[PDB]
């Protein structure tokens, strides 16, 4: 549900996640 | 008696002996494989 949170949930474990790599311009 | 060996002989194995040897080897394997695998 929370797209903002799940990104911050799994990126500390793994920063090469697809959702972190895509649309990283807006971050 | 000279440079070559006078006792030089060759081994002869015809097709009947080849068949007998192959049959003996395979039949021995058939008989004993059941006991080797156990």
């Amino acid at each position: 549900q929370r797209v903002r949170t799940v990104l911050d949930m799994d990126d500390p474990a793994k920063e090469e996640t697809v959702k972190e790599l895509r649309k990283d311009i807006n971050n | 008696m000279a440079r070559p060996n006078p006792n030089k002989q060759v081994v002869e194995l015809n097709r009947s002996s080849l068949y007998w040897g192959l049959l003996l080897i395979f039949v021995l394997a058939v008989l004993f494989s059941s006991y080797i695998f156990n």
């Binding site: 911050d8 949930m9 996640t17 | -």
Partner: protein, 484 residues
């Protein structure tokens, strides 16, 4: 005499003995297929389809058997865990026995073609010498290949007569062999679209039939005949080796990167699936969607399937084994028997930490537990003398919310360090290392072994194509120039 590396050049100007040695090789390959299938059936354990699948057991030819339709065996079991219906003659062992019988028949045909090599069919009618009409042979073979491709794509994979192919969940949870409707749009060129394989095989079969008819009806030009040496069997050898190593590079690439023709449930997960957080992202999205609908986070994790958590584990990484770490994946780190759960870590004051996962390149990795923002908040230190992040003083406790460990909160830092070290590998799983006397180091997947073998074979056959192209372009100087 002949050098040891030239003993097969005797069948160059001998079509009958060339057919005989082709039949010998074909018999050896079919016999290997049958024997390998029976070895894998003998060493296969179908008890746990979810947590001990075939790719965890080092199964090489069983994924390829399964991919085209056979699923149940003569032992009454099925790899999907379903109840076995009548297998018919085409089970795993049935296909293996058919391959062995075919190998014996090809052996007998090879013996016959070795003895009877002077057939008038291999003789030129107007000159009396021995010759092969290679363009016409190519036309006939291309027509047969087009017919086979069209039949395999229109009857087998579409399920109008055959069983279909293996299609699955994108996350590899639910999958089976079923018919696939062809996709004639641009989506048919989508590599992961299963519908693009029947559309391919139909269209390529039709085009191959048309091209075979064209080669049957139309002779080549004289300039092209002399340029490519179409009267030489060495030239077609070089061209065939070129096409074959092209196809080997293609299959190695598709196996490594994953495709619709390379299912996860059959060949294991992908190193890019591990690197890109595919299963991890899906698991976290499922947990977030469950907990956003008013669900406690001990039972939102219990809704997570056993198979998905097993997929989210670096020990299943194909790019994790070794060149001489031989054998099954189970023989490396035990047979998985259960999911311990999702290790959630908290500090003394209380905030969620995340263990930084091991990347694919690393044989070893320092154990760190960082914050949601991205700041290192704890770790398992090396020096332990000036430690300002060690768990013993930070106060990191693990909670667990899964199968065997659902509410067991461990505040013991000695166990917390061990659980963090298990958490950097992905989802923590319980393993049995005494059944197969397991090693400890991670092994490679059949996907990785296939890719390595075929890439090595592809480079070797690039060299072979270069050598044979040299031998056929330079045939006169490889024979002699006679002082001119």
């Amino acid at each position: 005499g002949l050098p040891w590396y030239r003993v097969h050049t005797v069948v160059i100007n001998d079509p009958g003995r060339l057919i005989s040695v082709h039949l010998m090789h074909t018999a050896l390959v079919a016999g290997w297929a049958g024997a390998m299938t029976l070895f894998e059936i003998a060493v296969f354990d179908p008890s746990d389809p979810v947590l001990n699948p075939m790719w965890r057991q080092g199964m090489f030819v069983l994924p390829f058997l399964t991919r085209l339709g056979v699923t149940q065996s003569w032992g009454g079991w099925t790899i999907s865990g379903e109840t076995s219906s009548n297998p018919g003659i085409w089970s795993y062992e049935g296909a293996a026995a058919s391959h062995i019988v075919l190998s014996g028949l090809l052996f007998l045909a090879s013996v016959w073609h070795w003895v009877y090599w002077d057939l008038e069919l291999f003789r030129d009618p107007r000159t009396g010498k021995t010759a092969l009409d290679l363009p016409k042979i190519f036309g006939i073979h291309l027509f047969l290949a087009g017919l086979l491709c069209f039949g395999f794509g229109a009857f087998h994979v579409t399920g109008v007569f055959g069983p279909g192919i293996w299609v699955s969940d994108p996350y590899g949870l639910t999958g089976s062999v079923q018919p696939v409707a062809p996709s004639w749009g641009a989506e048919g060129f989508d590599p992961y679209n299963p519908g693009g394989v029947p559309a391919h095989h139909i269209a390529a079969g039709i085009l191959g039939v048309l091209a075979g008819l064209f080669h049957l009806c139309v002779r080549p030009s004289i300039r092209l005949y002399f340029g490519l040496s179409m009267g030489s069997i060495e030239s077609v050898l070089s061209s065939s080796i070129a096409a074959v190593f092209w196809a080997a590079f293609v299959v190695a690439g598709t196996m490594w990167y994953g495709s619709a023709a390379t299912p996860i449930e059959l060949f294991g997960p992908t190193r890019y699936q591990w690197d890109q957080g595919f299963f991890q992202q899906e698991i976290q999205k499922r947990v977030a969607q469950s907990t956003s609908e008013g669900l406690s986070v001990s039972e939102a994790w219990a809704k997570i399937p056993e198979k998905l958590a097993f997929y989210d584990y670096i020990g299943n990484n194909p790019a994790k084994g070794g060149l001489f770490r031989t054998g099954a994946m189970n023989s490396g780190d035990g047979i998985a028997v259960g999911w311990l759960g999702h290790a959630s870590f908290k500090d003394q004051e209380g905030r969620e930490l995340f263990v930084r996962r091991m990347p694919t390149f690393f044989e070893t990795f320092p154990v760190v537990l960082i914050d949601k923002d991205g700041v290192v908040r704890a770790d398992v230190p090396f020096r332990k003398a000036e430690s300002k992040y060690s768990i013993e003083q930070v106060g990191v406790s693990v909670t667990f919310y899964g199968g065997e460990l659902n509410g067991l909160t461990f505040t013991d830092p000695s166990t917390v360090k061990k659980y963090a070290r298990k958490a950097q590998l992905g989802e923590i799983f319980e393993f049995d290392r005494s059944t197969l006397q397991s090693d400890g180091v991670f092994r490679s997947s059949p996907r990785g072994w296939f890719t390595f073998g075929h890439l090595s074979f592809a480079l070797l056959f690039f060299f072979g194509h270069i050598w044979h192209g040299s031998r056929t372009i330079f045939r006169d100087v490889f024979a002699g120039i006679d002082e001119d």
